[PDB]
Design a protein around this ligand. Structure first.
Ligand SMILES: CCCCCCCCCCO[C@@H]1O[C@H](CO)[C@@H](O[C@H]2O[C@H](CO)[C@@H](O)[C@H](O)[C@H]2O)[C@H](O)[C@H]1O
Ligand SMILES: CCCCCCCCCCO[C@@H]1O[C@H](CO)[C@@H](O[C@H]2O[C@H](CO)[C@@H](O)[C@H](O)[C@H]2O)[C@H](O)[C@H]1O
Lengths: 260, 328, 330, 252
């Protein structure tokens, strides 16, 4: 598993005694108000804060399938985890084909082999991202929604099964329209179940985390203040201290958070 | 998949070679092609035309190819490393260093005569290295901080150059003014015996980084997640640039829009993939410079126009064009 | 809704500038104590020659340093507001290049009236500052990115003409060009200040008449448009006012040199971005810094008279080295 | 009444669009990305009809008179725009920003209003702070206080929100939308706001207009408009509605 045990990250401490584990096959959604430290915790699971990169000091164990992250080379690490970020407007007008292929960079053997399996994976990843209509296109004529499908294609390409890995979503779901957001978190869950992949996704709408996550970690002031299935964690008292927001729950035919 | 441009590369090649021949058959010392072929063939009647072709005119052609090729390829690399088409090989401060190296030699003293490119060369690299050291923090290099370190050291450098120009006499002024204007009139074989391997090496370090450069143009954080040593690569690209551009400007003076223009055309022609753009740029760079330097030798002959002048008369419609391009 | 207790900062600089200014007259190549120099300028028959060295050789140079500093300080404050960016220099308009084109066109194509040089630099300064504007504006919307792109392109073409003209210049012409291009207050005489000063003051007036609109524009261009600021008319009024003051100054001082970046940046860090403080604040501090720089040249290497651009670059370098050290981490 | 009748904007991104913002009421505008929400908002603001290369046809009127005929600086006293809190180019104090709200009016009653604006927006602890030390939530609150300073009454004006709820937290985007209505009602003031979360508009709008491919496809109180088939042809998204005792939208 991908695991933080008694994690501290530090300018004071932004993460204080934090313990969370990402389970292969299951999707863990990360909730918290702005500044709660969600994006730090995720950078920490990426390994941006531990190794020959930083002055910020980190304490406690963080573990990927059994070894401390700090002992995992950025090249090797690029094969066990991938990060789907956000503000994807590229600096130069690459093609879609090129963006996705770049996800095969940590695998390309010579240095940038672009082998035939790689062009297939790139096509099959564009397939599951639902972006295969966009083969050819200049990435700068793409709506933010199309581009967001392409970046998802590219991050799948990097994790494609070959010869347990981890996918870290950094608020991928916002600025997608409604139907789009549910589409992506459904596919993410499917991939996580099919490839035995551990997913941590930072999500804004707690109702959205409720429908698509197997597990929820509510992060309040550098610490995880609730963890577990959407049924048990999603409660008025928890939403209360995580968000300062007085809510109530309501049923359907997964239960929805509602104000007042 | 959607991008078959190796004919673009191969075309630029043919056009470059073609231009090379055309440059060897024109023009100041009047040689008709018939005396040109006889001279190259060993006919003793064409003995003086041969010395011109091989001792005056060949070194300038090969230098123009080195200059244009070196600026195109390092433009290609700088713009990928900074993910901005406007990044220019000079941002390291190599160009000021060379100016300061050359102008402290012209104005103080001493030795001769291949001493001018050595001072210019040691000045570039030293100012390059200083600008790097001021920005890095052992060991993380932010590219914003590189620029500030550059603005600042170029301030300091420019003052030292201003002070030398001030205490210089009329001969020494004539030399700075023209050294900084750009020229290939110097070119002889022993010169570019040294320069060529210097920029031959730089280009090898840059091609050796092309795949990491492509990942980088996707995101510094994105490249980092794919396994690129983003810190080690910035330092690697910067050295290679400071190295070929240093050797180049040390014996051509300051030129002059090519490192911006050629990569931007190949990027418009073939997309940004560093695997095509660096050879493409180096190729189109060498082609545009030869063409420029040919015009300088012959447009007002026997005047030898500084080629800084001509390569600016290239950047002017280019920038005016991509103005007109991006009105929306 | 309180305030920041600036106006004493403004008052101090005015005093410090004024003080320094007075001492500047006594420490040039002609050394004279405050007492004897007062007496001479006030009509003492015993000091008719001393009045002539002070009122004719020193004064125009000290006054020119105040016009240059105050000019660059104020136009920089305006441009940095206009571009919402502390790195906009007053040069970018186009005007510096045209000055250097017109100055070199005249020095090199002789076929000399001492009013011929500044008038040429001023015409070229405005013409290429006006040509760059037309290339960027589309009758009539002025995108600041396109203004910068026209500038890059028109600057390339003017440097082509300059180097071409330098290339053909004989020894005397080359010596003017490089001297003028290092920046000097040593050409300062009253008859030209009669012309330069009202330009700088009229540019100065036009900027002040825009201190509120510029403050609103610091909020966002579209934000300011929603507040009623006519941001297109605002862009053009600042540029023509900057072009008019800088063009007058480069015409008789040459190329200098970092003040319009440095001065409005310290006044800001002391009093905030409020255009109502910064524009007079930066001009006082600019006049104070330029004069400190010219007092430095006429002194540190006496009797050499060091180019002023060299000394103002020796302010720029520590200023940007301070910026660097400050914005580590960030 | 701020009204658009048979409004076209240009290809064409708004096709025959009729809608009306009316005082005391908050209309919320819903649509997917690229539906022309932001174009229509700029149109009401008067950005595409004064003097400032696109084609606009139809009547857009503010309290009777056509927008095409209202100066920018007088127009600035009839409407204001909340643009989602951006940190300015230079470090103004919170007071200087809010007072800038008073720019179209400009002092003395100004400093008084800027205070009472800062208070209604719950951003008065922030006085004398540099806006660049502020979190985006505080920055949002201060920008809100600047727009209230601009519309403050003394002796029917309009407030347009261009997605101000954006990335405020759950509890703060609810406060802001509530306080808009509260102010819309007291000052008798027409509010048009682009909202992302359809349930957020349900809970705080008085009218919901849905934008589908350049044109309006529904308009009325949340109760009558928040239907599965409207959410379908607006968002291409299959939902159902659940009660609460404000019925909330849910997929499946
Ligand atoms: C990837 C880079 C590709 C660009 C190719 C450019 C390579 C240029 C390397 C320079 O090599 C020079 O070749 C000359 C050949 O002429 C030699 O001159 C020799 O011949 C001259 C005339 O032919 C004589 O004047 C000289 O004395 C004699 O050294 C010269 O020594 C040697 O250093
Ligand atoms: C805030 C920005 C505004 C700052 C204004 C700058 C102040 C500069 C004033 C310029 O006015 C000049 O004053 C000189 C005073 O000396 C006059 O010379 C006069 O005195 C000279 C000294 O001998 C004589 O040579 C001249 O003939 C005689 O005109 C000169 O004509 C006049 O134009």
């Amino acid at each position: 598993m991908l695991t933080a045990h008694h994690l501290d990250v530090a300018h004071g401490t932004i993460l204080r005694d934090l313990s969370l584990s990402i389970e292969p096959g299951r999707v863990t959604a990360l909730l918290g108000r702005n500044g709660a430290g969600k994006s730090t915790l995720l950078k920490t699971f990426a390994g941006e804060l531990t190794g020959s990169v930083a002055g910020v000091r980190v304490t406690g164990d963080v573990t990927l399938n059994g070894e401390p992250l700090a002992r995992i080379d950025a090249p090797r690490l690029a094969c066990l985890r991938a990060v789907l970020p956000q503000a994807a407007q590229p600096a130069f007008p690459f093609s879609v084909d090129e963006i996705v292929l770049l996800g095969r960079y940590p695998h390309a053997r010579r240095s940038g082999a672009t082998s035939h399996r790689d062009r297939d994976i790139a096509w099959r990843a564009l397939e599951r991202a639902g972006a295969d209509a966009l083969v050819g296109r200049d990435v700068t004529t793409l709506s933010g929604g199309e581009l967001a499908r392409v970046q998802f294609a590219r991050v799948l390409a990097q994790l494609w099964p070959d010869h347990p890995r981890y996918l870290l979503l950094d608020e991928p779901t916002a600025a997608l329209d409604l139907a789009h957001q549910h589409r992506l978190l459904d596919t993410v869950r499917a991939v996580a179940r099919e490839w035995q992949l551990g997913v941590l996704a930072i999500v804004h709408d707690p109702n959205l985390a409720a429908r698509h996550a197997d597990a929820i970690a509510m992060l309040a002031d550098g610490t995880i203040v609730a963890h577990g299935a959407p049924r048990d964690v999603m409660t008025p008292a928890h939403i209360a201290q995580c968000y300062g927001f007085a809510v109530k729950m309501v049923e359907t035919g997964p239960p929805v958070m509602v104000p007042a | 998949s959607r991008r078959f441009a190796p004919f673009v590369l191969a075309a630029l090649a043919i056009l470059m070679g073609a231009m090379s021949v055309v440059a060897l058959c024109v023009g100041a010392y009047r040689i008709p092609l018939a005396e040109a072929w006889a001279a190259l063939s060993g006919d003793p009647a064409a003995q003086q035309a041969r010395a011109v072709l091989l001792d005056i005119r060949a070194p300038r052609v090969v230098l123009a190819l080195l200059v244009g090729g070196g600026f195109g390829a390092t433009g290609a690399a700088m713009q990928a490393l900074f993910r901005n088409p406007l990044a220019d090989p000079g941002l390291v401060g190599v160009s000021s260093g060379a100016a300061l190296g050359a102008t402290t030699l012209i104005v103080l003293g001493h030795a001769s005569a291949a001493a001018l490119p050595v001072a210019a060369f040691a000045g570039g690299l030293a100012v390059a290295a200083l600008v790097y050291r001021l920005a890095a923090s052992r060991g993380r290099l932010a590219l914003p901080l590189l620029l500030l370190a550059g603005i600042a050291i170029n301030a300091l450098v420019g003052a030292a150059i201003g002070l030398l120009t001030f205490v210089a006499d009329d001969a020494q002024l004539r030399s700075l003014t023209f050294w900084s204007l750009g020229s290939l009139g110097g070119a002889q074989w022993p010169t570019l015996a040294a320069v060529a391997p210097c920029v031959a090496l730089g280009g090898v370090l840059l091609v050796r980084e092309r795949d990491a450069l492509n990942a980088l143009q996707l995101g510094e954080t994105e490249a980092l997640h794919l396994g690129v040593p983003v810190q080690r690569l910035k330092r690697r690209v910067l050295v290679a640039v400071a190295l070929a551009v240093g050797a180049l400007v040390s014996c051509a003076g300051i030129i002059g829009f090519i490192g911006l223009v050629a990569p931007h055309c190949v990027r418009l022609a073939c997309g940004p993939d560093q695997r095509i753009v660096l050879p493409g740029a180096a190729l189109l760079g060498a082609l545009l410079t030869l063409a420029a330097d040919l015009a300088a030798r012959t447009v007002a002959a026997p005047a030898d126009i500084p080629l800084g002048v001509l390569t600016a008369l290239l950047g002017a419609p280019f920038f005016l064009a991509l103005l007109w391009k991006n009105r929306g």
